[PDB]
Each structure stands twice: as C-alpha cells, then as structure tokens.
Design a protein around this ligand. Structure first.
Ligand SMILES: *[C@@H]1O[C@H](CO)[C@@H](O[C@@H]2O[C@H](CO)[C@@H](O)[C@H](O)[C@H]2NC(C)=O)[C@H](O)[C@H]1NC(C)=O
Lengths: 518, 50, 513
C-alpha cells in the first residue's frame, strides 16, 4: 500500500513531581513523540496527569492586596475605583452598596472596534488567537474625549493609543507571453523511362519496356504556447494600536490560570497554559485588511503531420512476328501511401484568492474569481474600519505579564515559563510530521498532523492529482539536539521533504546549520 | 482614477488627515518633570547618538 | 456481480434485568445487534435497549450528592452559592432564583445582550459513526454570573429615518453575551478561494494503403492485391475544482470546569459505577461518541466538474482478384471489417454549506458574482460550523467540575471501544460502485452515487467502471496466548471491483493481552 496510517506515539510518563506546597497537588506528563497522521489512531488526551497530596509543607499566602478586593473576582482595585459608575471588578463588588455612584463617563461612548480581539493572546508559532489575557474593558477612570469622525470612544486603561492612521497600497502586475512556431515542407519526385526496339529482317521482332516512378513526402509541425500571470494585492491600513508598556490589568481567566501554575517546574502545566492562552501578547499592531489575487495560465498546443507516397510501374511487351505470331504483355506495379497526424492541446490554470477583514458579503464577493469593481473595493474598505484584521504585530512573550504585583514567586514562574516556552517551540513545530506527498504542507494540529493540499491536489496526503509531475519544495527535518558544550550547535538535514524530486522546487530555507555559545 | 473618487477622498481627508509635513525637535528636549531630569536629558541625548 | 440477498435484522436474547436502581425505580436490559437487515429484509422491531419501572425496596441512600453547594431540586446541578439569587436562572428548576428576597443579589446587568447566535451547536455532542448531532453536552445557556461579551464586527445594519432622510446603521446586536463554556469566540472575517483547471485533448490518425498488381497476358492472367488500414484515436479530459471557504468566527471550549448540560448531568449520575454495557451504550447513543472543543464558523462552497470523452474508429479492407481468359474465368476474395465506438462521461457536484436555503440553493445551481455576493450576505445571519475538533465523549469527565469519576470514565472508555465496533458502518455489507454504507440504529443502507441503483448500488447503467475496495470489519480479537493479541481484516468488502484503489489501512491489528 502507498499510504500507511501512523498512529500517535507519546512518551512514557515523567516522574511524579514533589507535592506543590500551594496547590497541594502533584503532576506528571508525557511528550508527544509522534503525531498521528494519515488517519492514524489518535492518542488519548492524557499527556497530563494530576494527583492530590497531603500538605507536607505550607507555602506563601496569596500576594497582599492593598486596595479593595472584588468579592467574586478578588481583583485588587484602587479605592478611588469604587462608586465610580464603572465595573472595574468584572463584578459589581466595587459598586455594590455604594451610597452614591458618581458617573464620570456620562456621555455615550463606544469601545474601539475589535479592541477586545487584541486583548487575546496569540500562539506565535501558529499566529492564532487564544484565550483572553488582558482586560480591555477596565477603564480605571479615563474618560478623556477620544473621537473618530463624529463617533466618540472610551479608551481602555491598558491601551496607550488607538488611532485611525489610514493608508492604502494597491499593486497590480499582469504579464502575458505568447510564442508560436510553424514548420512545413512539400517535396515531390517523378521519373519516367522508355526503351523499345522494333526491327524488320523474313523476320520481325519488337520489344517495349515502360517505367514510371513517383515519390512524394510532406512534413508539418506546429507549436503554440500562451502564458498569463496576474498578481493583484490591496494592503489597507485603518488604525494603529499600541498597548501601554506597564502596569497592565490582566484578564481574570488568565490571572487565575497563572495562579494555579505549579511552583516546581513541570512542563505539562505551562504547556496547557500556552494551549489555552498562547505564548505572546500584542503590544503594537496595525489593523486593516488584505486582498490578494494570483492567476496562472499555461496554454500549450502542438500539431505534427506527415505524408509519404511511393509509386512504381513496370510493363514490358516483346512481340516476334514472321503465319506465326507470339506476344506477351507483362506489367506490374506497387502503390504505397502513409498519412500520420498527431495533435495535443494542454491547458493548465490555477487561481488563488485571499481576503482578510470586512463584512462577509464583501469578503465573499471578493472571493469570487473575477477581479472586483472599484465600488465593491470601496465598500470592503469601508467595512474594514469596523472589523479589521491585524496586519502587523509586535509581540512580547506572555511571561512578561507575570509580575510580582500580581503573583507570588514571580521570578520562579517567569523562569518556568521561559523553560516551558522553549520546550513548547520544539514540541509544536511542524518539523515533526511525516512529509506530505503532492507538495502538501503538514500543519501540526495538536496531537495530529494535517496536510494542507495545494490547489489541484486532494486526499489525506495530497496523493490525488491529475498533474503527472509538479515541483516539490524542500522541507526541513527537525533541527538536531544541542551539540555538547564546546560551543553550541544544531543542524538541519533539509531532508523531511526532498527538495529535488519531480522537477524539485525551491531548496529549503537557510540556515542548514545553527551554532551558538553554550 | 475617477473624478468622483478623487473628489470624495480629498473630502474625507479633512476628517482623517495624516501628518505629511513636519519639522522635528529632538526627543530629549521633552525630558522633564522627573527625578534627575537634567541628567536623564543628557543620557537620552547620548543614547540617541548611539 | 449479481445482487446480494436480503438478510433479516437479528438481535441476541435479552440480557438479564439490572437490579432496580434505588434512586430511579428502573430496571434496564440490553440486547446486542447480531445482524442488521443489510440489503433489505425484515428490520427488527425490537430495540437494542429496554427499561422498566421497578420499586427498589431500598432508598436512594446516595441522594445527598452535594452539601454546602446549592443543589437544585429538579436536577443534581450544584451551584456556587453566589449564583443563588444572582438574577440568572442557573438551572431548569429555577430554584436558585426562587424566593429571592434580596433583588440586589443579582450578579450583574448583563441581560440586554443576547447569547451568540449559533453557539448552541458547539454544545451538541457528535456521533462519528453517523456524523449526526447528539444531545447537548455543554450547557449552551449558562453564564456563571459572568458578563463576558463579544464584539460582533458585522453589527452594521442600514436604517432609513424617513422623517430625517438620515441613512444610518442601527447599533443593535453590536455585542453578544458569551456563554461561560466558550473560552473564546473570535469574530474574524477570512476568505480563501482555490481553483484548478486542466484540459488534455489528443487526437491521432493513421492511414496505410498497399496495392500489388501483376498482369501477364499473351491466354490472359492478371492478379491484383490491395491492403488498406485506417485507425482513429481521440481522448478529451477536463477537470476543474473550486473551493471557496469563508470564515466568520473562531470559538474554543473551556477545558476547565465544563458545566455539563443538565440532561447530560442527570443521565451521567444515573450510570452505575459498575460496568454495564447497555447503560453506557445508551449514554453514548444519546450524547454521542464525541464532544467538540475547537470551532470555526463559516460558509463553504465546493464545485467539481470532470468530463472524459474518447472516440476510436477503425476500418480494414483487403482484396485479391485473379483472372484467366482465353472462355474466361474471374475470381477474387478477401477480408473487410468496419467498427466505430464512442463514449462520453460527465458529472458535476456542487454543494454549499452556509447561511440561507434560498441563496445556498441558488449558488449550488449558479456560480456568479450575484450568487457569491448574496450568499455572502446570507452568511451574516446563518453561519455554520465549518470545521471542528473533537475528543472522545469520555474525556469531558476528566474536565468536569464533578471530579475524578474514574470508574465511570473507564467504563465509558470500554463501552465506547465496543460500541465503535458494534454499530460500525463496516458491518453493513459491500456497497458496490463507491456506494457508502450507513448503519442507522439497527438498519443498513447503501447511499448510491448517481451512476448506481439498487439496494447495494450493484446494478449500473454502464457495464464496468473503476470502483474502489473497502475494508471488511475487523475479525474478533484472537485469544492472547502470549501477552499479545491479534485482530485481522481484509480489503474485500468489496474487493476493488475494476482495479480501483485498494483500501489503504492496516491489514492486521494487534493488541495488549
Ligand atoms: C504544400 O502543398 C499544399 C497544397 O498546394 C499547400 O497548401 C495550399 O497552398 C495554396 C497557396 O498558399 C492555397 O491556395 C491552397 O488552398 C492550400 N491548400 C491546402 C490544402 O493547404 C501548402 O502550403 C504547401 N506547403 C509547402 C510547405 O509547400
């Protein structure tokens, strides 16, 4: 069989760690040794295990709150943020039982459109949003007037600026190429010969020989090649967002999940943390939308035509007359004719379209195969104001949120996150997968790996295509372990997909080998 | 581009204008109202040079 | 292949009644499905599962499932007490909101925002054997007293005030209340389109003619031979594929403290801690083999068109003719034959998953800027679960607020392992011609693609075409004589009929004793 399903493999357990003095629990975990692929069996969702403990030792109490404590959330909030007219808890505790609530933001104020998306962490290795890490609805007062057009906004406490730095870059490149070549010949041969004798002597003798020969040859060959490349792209930018550098108010959920992290290092918990919330958070971003269109046409026609003819004639007549008469007429011929015609017509077309940001109406109409009307591009860019994608991102790793202001043992947790994150970058890399066929890209998807098959390819491994051969791009295998310290080094065999096969495409990226101080 | 589209854009700019011409002042001239402000202003000058 | 025969659906005898469960006053018993009805034949009227009223002679000693937590009367949902009188009915009983003297016990002023539309399907269980929604696993309507909202980026909706001439967008539905079980519900407008189109057309023609003539006359003899062959071959192949995938949401389900649906909760507590296959089988059949924990919400369109045309024509003729003269005699003979064969086959599949019956039908009929735009508009209102990740139904238990449940969880794992290889579609017989076997309840179908007809898709309007094999069901486990057990399966249900693909997976399976 061509395919062979490969089941998930994951390691034997770690040791149990020692009982966590605060969590009164102990932990155990396993590493994903091999993701399941090609419809292999998926492993049980138990790469983590947990146990309860006796309290072999106490630990530090939860960090002192000098402010008010929000009853349900336990958000430590400043006493100036009570009776404020705003919920600063995610709960009414701040405003609960206030004798008088002094509404500061009396006006009608909108939140910045999509601002709460940016409070989500991202998995940088996936570039995909995760659970909320920051609370962008916490205003902590504020109520400075921020306007966009006539619409006035209330900025989150966390956000330093959200400002409509509008810009747009269009780019159109059309390249059409034609070649034709034609070749013909016409060629002809005819030969005729006669020889006869007729004499009187009494006696009479006569002889006649007839020869005719014709040869004809024709050849025709035609090639027609017609090639079109059309790449169009619109980069639209609508707002600039920056997070404040300092004293961020975290989201409750992230706060608590951090609170539950073990003080002893055990990768499984920080792994689950990243899988919930990801690895990084967005300090600065450019918000807008992308449209990108790319069509490839190759039209190749060839014709070949051949004609061959041979003709031969022979007749001979010899007659002797002296009454006596004898005659023979003897004649023979062969005709040969060949016609041979071969024609091939091949058309290969592919299109890819890609859109981000805006309303679904505009997104899909732009997802049709026709280049858009300027009107619909206007309508799309109008609607991107309200539902933009994130074009540019500048990120900081999530551990930079872990701050003593919020968490006991902040340094320890921070360091654990660094270590865990480093291991996480290894374990979640796509390098681990078996190679796709068909120039497919393996996307690791938790414990199993999916081949994103290109346009014109199908099946679990992209094994189905009508194209006989197409360039296969090279893919790195996983980088080696760290070389033992006398200097530090890694290597990549560029092997996992071989770059050369099937008119092999690009070689892999550099570097093939990476070296460092220990 | 169409006369309408250019016209309408040139209208909209009045409400979402960008900075297009500027005369700059060095950022250290703003180091102010902080402890050791006078010293930090020199160290920020040097850091801008760096 | 001639039609296979019907078989009657067949069930084993009843298992014995379970002892009458003290809290439920119910006896239970199960049959096992020894044979579905397969290719027609008598369906079972018997169900696989049966339950009967029975007084237990013993009290519900366990009824005290919860202490300090507030437990609803109707249902074992135990709530953290801040939720009592919190203003939101946190169980179907509503008792947590009953007799609440303290109106200021309400948690927050959230209710103006309605729940995310379409959030309910993310709650429902999934049955991988039938690809059908189950009952709810998650409580889709539970907020835990929290007021997490979600910015609906498509909130814009034109309104015209005739009295003003103002043309404006109505603010309504600018946000949705996120249900507690959703960790995230990222509105994110994406589209990706991919098209390929490949045309291969080849035509070849040959002619070959021989004449061979001899005449010799004084008595007259004259012999002529002709051989001529003409042979035409044409093959025309068109394949085009369009995949346009639109996304509007990414949603993820919390891995912690999953608030099970009330019905699921009850049904779960009713399960015995001892293994009883019938009970857990019923549970899986109700809530599905699998529950979902990752989502995108989207519309999808796919268009596939394949046309093959081939024409082959041949003529052959020979003659030999001969003559003897001076009385005169003439003879001749030879072989001539003529044939033409031609065929064309064409099919299209156009399918849309997305937000309106009218426009999704229209776009299934007719691809255009008009149907793409109007279907995209319709996706504003009725997006669909376009992709999801899932886990076995038993893994929720680890993640529930309840605790270990590990007896139940292991029982459910065993039951699943069985159920997946009892109600498996493989046990419906060979669907020929790439028909899909389906086992619903106790009964089988073959779903036939349009070329095929009949109970097994067996008869075909044309006489033979490439159709793929499929696996038989796994045999029983061997005895494990060593510490290892074996299981065997063959790519013969059906065999690849005309050299279609051999089915890809393992022929042989092996297992720890
Ligand atoms: C080979 O001979 C054919 C037949 O004469 C040529 O094609 C003809 O060309 C004349 C003049 O251009 C036209 O008036 C005829 O209509 C053509 N007939 C056909 C059947 O094509 C052909 O051009 C010649 N090719 C070469 C290379 O000499």
């Amino acid at each position: 069989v061509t395919l062979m399903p490969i089941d998930c493999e994951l390691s034997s357990w770690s040791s149990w760690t020692t009982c966590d003095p605060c969590q009164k629990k102990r932990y155990r975990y396993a590493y994903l040794l091999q993701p399941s692929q090609f419809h292999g069996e998926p492993c049980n969702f138990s790469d983590k295990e947990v146990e309860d403990c006796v309290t072999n030792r106490p630990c530090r109490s939860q960090v002192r709150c000098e402010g008010f404590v929000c009853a349900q959330t336990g958000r430590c909030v400043n006493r100036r943020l009570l009776c404020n007219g705003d919920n600063d808890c995610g709960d009414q505790s701040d405003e609960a039982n206030c004798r008088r609530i002094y509404k500061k933001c009396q006006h009608e104020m909108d939140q910045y459109w999509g601002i709460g998306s940016l409070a989500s962490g991202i998995n940088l290795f996936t570039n995909s949003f995760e659970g909320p890490v920051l609370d962008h609805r916490y205003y902590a007062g504020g109520c400075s007037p921020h306007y966009i057009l006539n619409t006035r906004f209330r900025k989150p406490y966390n956000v330093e600026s959200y400002t409509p730095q509008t810009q747009g870059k269009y780019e159109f490149i059309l390249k059409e190429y034609e070649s034709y070549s034609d070749f013909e010949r016409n060629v002809t041969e005819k030969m005729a010969s006669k020889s006869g004798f007729s004499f009187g002597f009494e006696l009479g003798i006569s002889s006649q020989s007839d020869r005719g020969k014709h040869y004809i040859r024709r050849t025709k060959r035609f090639s027609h090649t017609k090639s079109v490349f059309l790449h169009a792209r619109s980069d639209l930018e609508v707002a600039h967002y920056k997070l404040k550098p300092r004293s961020l108010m975290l989201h409750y959920e992230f706060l608590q999940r951090v609170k539950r992290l073990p003080l002893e290092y055990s990768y499984g918990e920080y792994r689950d943390l990243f899988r919930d919330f990801g690895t990084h958070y967005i300090t600065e971003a450019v918000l807008g939308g992308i449209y990108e269109y790319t069509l490839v046409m190759n039209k190749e026609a060839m014709e070949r035509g051949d004609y061959t003819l041979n003709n031969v004639h022979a007749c001979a007549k010899n007659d002797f007359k002296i009454s006596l008469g004898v005659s023979v007429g003897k004649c023979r011929g062969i005709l040969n004719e060949i016609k041979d015609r071969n024609k091939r017509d091949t058309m290969v077309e592919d299109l890819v379209v890609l859109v981000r940001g805006g309303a679904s109406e505009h997104i899909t109409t732009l997802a049709y195969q026709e280049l858009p009307t300027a009107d619909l591009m206007q309508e799309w860019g109008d609607a991107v104001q309200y539902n933009p994608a994130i074009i540019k991102v500048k990120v900081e790793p999530l551990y930079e949120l872990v701050t003593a202001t919020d968490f006991a043992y902040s340094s320890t947790v921070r360091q654990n996150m660094k270590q865990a994150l480093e291991e996480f970058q290894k374990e979640v890399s796509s390098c681990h997968c078996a190679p796709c066929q068909g120039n497919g890209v393996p996307v690791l998807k938790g414990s199993r790996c999916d081949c994103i098959c290109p346009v014109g390819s199908q099946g679990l491994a992209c094994e189905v295509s009508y194209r006989k051969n197409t360039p296969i791009d090279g893919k790195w295998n996983c980088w080696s372990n760290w070389s033992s310290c006398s200097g530090r080094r890694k290597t990549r065999q560029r092997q996992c997909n071989n770059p050369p096969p099937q008119n092999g495409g690009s070689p892999c990226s550099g570097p093939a080998s990476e070296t460092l101080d220990c | 581009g169409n006369k309408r589209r250019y016209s309408a854009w040139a209208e909209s700019v009045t409400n979402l204008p960008q900075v297009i011409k500027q005369k700059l002042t060095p950022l250290y001239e703003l180091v102010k109202e902080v402890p050791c402000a006078s010293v930090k202003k020199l160290y920020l000058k040097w850091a801008l040079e760096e | 292949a001639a039609t296979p025969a019907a078989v009657t659906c067949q069930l084993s005898n009843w298992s014995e009644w379970t002892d009458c469960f003290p809290c439920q006053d119910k006896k239970y018993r199960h049959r096992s499905l020894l044979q579905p009805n397969k290719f027609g034949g008598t369906i079972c009227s018997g169900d696989i599962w049966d339950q009967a009223s029975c007084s237990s002679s013993t009290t519900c000693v366990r009824q005290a499932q919860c202490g300090q937590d507030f437990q609803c009367k109707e249902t074992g949902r135990c709530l953290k007490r801040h939720l009592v009188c919190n203003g939101d009915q946190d169980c179907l009983d509503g008792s947590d909101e009953d007799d609440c003297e303290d109106v200021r016990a309400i948690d927050e002023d959230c209710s103006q925002y309605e729940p995310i539309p379409g959030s309910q399907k993310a709650a429902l269980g999934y049955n991988i054997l039938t690809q059908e929604d189950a009952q709810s696993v998650y409580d889709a309507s539970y907020y835990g007293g929290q007021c997490e909202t979600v910015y609906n980026g498509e909130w814009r909706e034109l309104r015209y005030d005739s009295t003003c001439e103002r043309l404006y967008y109505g603010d309504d539905e600018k946000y949705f209340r996120k249900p507690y079980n959703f960790l995230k519900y990222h509105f994110e407008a994406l589209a990706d389109t991919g098209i390929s189109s490949e045309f291969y057309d080849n035509a070849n023609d040959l002619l070959s003619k021989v004449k061979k003539d001899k005449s010799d006359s004084f008595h007259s003899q004259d012999t002529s031979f002709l051989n001529e062959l003409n042979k035409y071959n044409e093959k025309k192949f068109i394949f085009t594929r369009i995949f346009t995938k639109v996304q509007t949401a990414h949603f993820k389900m919390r891995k912690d403290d999953i608030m099970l649906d009330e019905g699921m909760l009850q049904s779960l507590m009713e399960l015995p801690d001892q293994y009883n296959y019938g009970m857990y089988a019923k549970f899986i059949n109700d809530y599905g083999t699998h529950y979902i924990t990752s989502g995108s919400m989207g519309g999808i369109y796919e268009y596939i068109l394949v046309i093959d045309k081939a024409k082959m024509e041949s003529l052959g003729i020979t003659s030999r003719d001969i003559t003897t003269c001076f009385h005169c005699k003439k003879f001749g003979g030879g072989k001539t034959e003529r044939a033409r064969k031609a065929m064309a086959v064409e099919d299209i599949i156009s399918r849309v998953r997305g937000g309106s019956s009218g426009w999704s039908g229209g776009l299934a009929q007719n691809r255009s800027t008009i149907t793409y735009r109007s279907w995209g508009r319709s996706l504003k209102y009725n997006p669909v679960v376009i992709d999801f990740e899932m886990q076995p139904i038993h893994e929720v238990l680890r993640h529930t607020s309840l605790g270990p449940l590990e007896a139940k969880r292991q029982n459910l794992r065993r039951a699943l392992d069985q159920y997946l290889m009892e109600f498996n579609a493989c046990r419906c017989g060979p669907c020929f011609n790439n028909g899909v076997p389906i086992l619903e309840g106790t009964s089988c179908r073959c779903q036939c693609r349009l070329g095929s007809l009949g109970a097994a898709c067996e008869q075909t309007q044309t006489e033979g075409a490439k159709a793929d094999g499929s696996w038989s069901c796994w045999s029983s486990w061997s005895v494990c004589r060593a510490g290892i057990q074996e299981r065997r399966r063959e790519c013969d249900n059906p065999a690849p009929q005309n050299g279609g693909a051999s089915c890809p997976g393992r022929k042989v399976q092996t297992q720890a004793c």
